[PDB]
Symmetry: C3
Subunit: 425 residues, 3 copies
């Protein structure tokens, strides 16, 4: 058949926990984005629309043909149409791909999902039992970051199944003892490895990449690096109670990646568990505990604020050898399309040094990791507009008077920071 | 056969290097715990006893049947009895499972071990040679943490084979050139991946999860994430000398995960190398150079102490636009069933904000990641008790007078921290 | 056949990005080192020479026989000769092996490379097509570190294919639509996992370790931990354009691990891409923007400098209910054959505590992780010499007068740090 899907690139807000909101980028106002399911040999038609005010694009791992000419560098308001044949069965990632630096920077902000290509060849348990699964479960594991600095460092704030911390503890997935389950698992990462496990289960058959040829049997874990996938076949044992789904990378399980398969003889067949996030929200309620934003300003502001005391060399003349010591500059890094620290408070007389730690400094716009810092809200006498900095390039500003400045990158306008200059009354 | 094993949950202290002690939890006073070996098709009876003052439990990956109802949420002094059939051959992890948050928090404190299910189908090198191994080696790789903060961040202090840094450098494993070795390897993690390697060897046959069907041949490395396992068959080449066992993740090999197979023509046949820690101690000697405790107070105390100077906004009135700036609070995180920083020294007038960074705030007791802070050693006029905080909830306290305080969490009484408040003697 | 290769251990400087220089250790002045290619069943003769002023050695994973007796603990000026038979086909790492602690410490400084053992049994796509590859590509992924602290913590500064950030973006690899490519991939790490991917491709056949028996089919990623390898067979789809080679661990792709296969119908047949770095330099030019050195002093110096104010307990007498508080010591760690922080600036009256965080404290020289700290080129009134510290051992020094001290480890003389003591004028 011919199958058609529409993906819409957008800026969004995701509710990842009770009272916890994440700012980022989506397809169709959900993270993970819409789940696409086709059969091996189908023609797949994609319409990609950019509804945002920055450039986006698309990579789709089910296509064994050129994609970036057709689906990259999609400007604000532009549409693309692309078709391909699904020649390889299994479980595939899709994600945003503006091109260059932006492929990595946008993917980590929420722009990812799953496409399943169901094989003509039946999986082994289906063949052996003469019937299809009693239940199919589709799961994405993914990470959320508090800053571009933390993204470079591999320090995830939350890790989750289908876009919400402990989603399937709050709403346990109903199963029955004796059910043939088929699980479709994709770890999008983007940094951390996963080892998927069910407490009370040994997976009978698993298929690396979801291809029926790549058979592994009798496993306690399914090992998956970023963008690795598996199809897993397992019968629920003939005993009632909770069979917990978890990653055995326990420093990530503790951050949200744990759910429950609740086995009861009379359990209802509910709507299909798709690898899709909850719909995004329109605004942040005033009752929020935390707002996470890797690229821009986050709440509460005080947990992202660095207040620097006066350097000992500025408080008075001090020295080591011959002449007086100069004060040390205070660094603000450009890193992972963000400014680190996000909010800096310094005393009059301090020199700030911007430094670009992003590495890919070719191309332009959302395809580049070059950055500048340009004031957009001026409450002081010393507004600033830095040059555009390549990797490892630097720019110094000395602040001599009190004031407060909100600034952005002109190339990537969702990058935002604050400098405040204080003085004794 | 029917096979019976007894596991005893307890609080323990492990000597992980010369003069270096680690506080945590165990089964039977060793980390890794008792190694269990059965045959495929055996009936396995487990007796679990809780000898500690907090709740514990057990998960056992060789069981393909419901376990949490029968072995979870085991109260202090309680016993459970459970049986299952070993239907699947291989190398399996077992670990503590109070339930919920505690599964992750207790496992990282030391409560893990191995159960092996030997297959009825013989492995390929045994079949080909017509005999069993000349020596079996059972190995667990595991991590130790200085704090729950470091646990969240994946920053291990030590990484080790069978519970002690460079154990098999200090005591090399005797083998002979030409020996048929069979290695049973489990990476328990709980955070880091392993690539097992022997210097001077290429592994002939390997079996993912220890299942004979999952064959990989001719490998320089055996890739294993947390709770992944392998069985490996290899012949020692016909040349004497040291063949070093190591993980090729070299930032973890450097932390303790390296040992020696010492090949000599006249080497005695030693008893099998079991995947079990050295038994623990009851007191820490005065000779100790370091005490590590992820949940509580560590030694020396100064290496875990943050001393804050007076906020510039408190030192005098300061301003940006017009009105004076407020001082920033000093943060104490509850994270990985610990307080971070462990010891905080602040000047009078300072406000502390407790914030709960643990995420799972459901259930109760050892099953929850809710926390409070309650003073239990009062050496000042301002002892305190916070509410019980869920994820991302906060509580502020302003300290106006000098003093010191040791506090715990009432939910998890092994969590411990210190606040000291200082003031110039001139006042 | 009988094949002979010469490896020369030395100290080197690599240009890993434009204007960015990395100090470390090499074979033959390139990182990765020379690529060695043999056939299954060949006798391989190695000549190892140590051209440096510290001990080096060699481990070679293609040898299934004792190596360390013959190639370990190679003193300055020494030569070793070693032969073995290549009995196992695939893609193997080699690296420095002085012994003990130094195996890990030297390998992370750049001393690694690839040896390929081509199988007698033909790979599947070569069998099916009746001909060899149109182009062979040999790729190493490796990491670079700013400090031994960062090495312990898994925090790589750069991650790259064949020794230079975005090398194959700056110079894309020409291919033709329809080409049979065979890729020989080795992740040397030494810490991070990789998931190798081509944008617009699904890998047809892959071989774990490069052994023809270990077949995996139809994959979007090839998962590889440190020292894991693959051989990958893939046909370029019949469409012109760029097919991007990348690791899906996107926090490492963003640090330099991304390249381009540029597909054109009229592309010339270039020479095979060898898994070898760019030859090093003898001096760092005036133009340089960054010098990285995990063991020693880096540039600019101020980005590695910690300046401490006077302890509140030294400023004035303070107490917590009883007698006056003592000041807390300021820690310098010995960790990963380096001092952390690299540069420390402290006020007169401050006590410093050196602590050895390296764990392996047996053996001697480059085989041990024992360390001391000793002032060279003395130009301050209070020079120091610490004892040689084992793991977790400590030593205190109280500084009472102003001055500057450059210091080294006597055991590992390339380790270097600075302490400066300041005083009000
Ligand atoms: Ca919740
Ligand atoms: Ca030791
Ligand atoms: Ca560049
Ligand atoms: Cu995008
Ligand atoms: Cu991709
Ligand atoms: Cu920018
Ligand atoms: Cu427990
Ligand atoms: Cu488990
Ligand atoms: Cu608690
Ligand atoms: Cu070396
Ligand atoms: Cu090696
Ligand atoms: Cu040294």
């Amino acid at each position: 058949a011919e199958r058609h899907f529409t993906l819409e690139a957008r800026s969004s807000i995701f509710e990842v926990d009770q009272g916890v909101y994440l700012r980022g980028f989506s397809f169709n106002d959900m993270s993970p984005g819409p789940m696409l399911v086709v059969e091996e040999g189908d023609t797949v038609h994609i319409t990609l629309r950019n509804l945002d005010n920055v450039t986006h694009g698309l990579s789709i791992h089910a296509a064994n043909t050129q994609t970036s000419r057709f689906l990259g560098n999609v400007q604000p308001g532009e549409t693309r149409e692309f078709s391909f044949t699904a020649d390889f069965p299994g479980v595939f990632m899709y994600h945003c791909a503006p091109g260059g630096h932006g492929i990595m920077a946008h993917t980590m902000g929420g722009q990812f999902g799953m496409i399943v290509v169901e094989p003509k060849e039946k999986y082994r348990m289906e063949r052996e039992l003469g019937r299809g699964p009693d239940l199919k479960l589709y799961i994405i594991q993914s990470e959320a970051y508090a800053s571009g600095r933390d993204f470079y460092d591999g320090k995830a704030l939350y890790v989750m199944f289908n876009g919400r911390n402990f989603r399937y503890v709050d709403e346990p997935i109903p199963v029955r003892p004796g059910d043939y389950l088929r699980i479709y698992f994709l770890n999008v990462g983007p940094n951390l490895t996963s080892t998927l496990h069910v407490v009370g289960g040994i997976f009978e058959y698993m298929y690396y990449q979801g291809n029926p040829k790549n058979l592994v049997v009798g496993a306690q874990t399914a090992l998956a690096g970023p963008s690795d996938s598996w199809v897993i076949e397992w019968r629920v044992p003939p005993v009632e109670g909770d069979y917990t789904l978890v990653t055995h990378v326990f420093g990530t399980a503790i951050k949200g990646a744990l759910g429950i398969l609740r086995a009861k003889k009379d359990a209802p067949r509910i709507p299909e568990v798709r690898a899709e996030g909850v719909p995004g929200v329109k605004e942040i309620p005033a009752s929020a505990k935390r707002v996470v934003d890797p690229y821009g300003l986050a709440s509460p502001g005080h947990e992202h604020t660095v207040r620097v005391p006066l350097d000992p060399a500025l408080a008075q003349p001090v020295a080591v050898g011959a002449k007086a010591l100069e004060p040390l500059p205070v660094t603000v890094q450009m890193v992972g399309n963000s400014f680190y620290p996000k909010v800096l408070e310094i005393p009059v007389g301090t020199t700030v040094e911007f430094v670009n730690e992003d590495v890919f400094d070719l191309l332009e716009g959302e395809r580049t990791g070059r950055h500048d810092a340009v004031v957009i809200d001026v409450q002081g006498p010393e507004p600033f507009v830095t040059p555009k900095l390549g990797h490892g390039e630097r720019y110094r500003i000395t602040f001599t008077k009190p004031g407060e400045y909100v600034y952005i990158c002109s190339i990537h306008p969702y990058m935002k920071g604050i400098i405040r200059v204080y003085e004794p009354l």
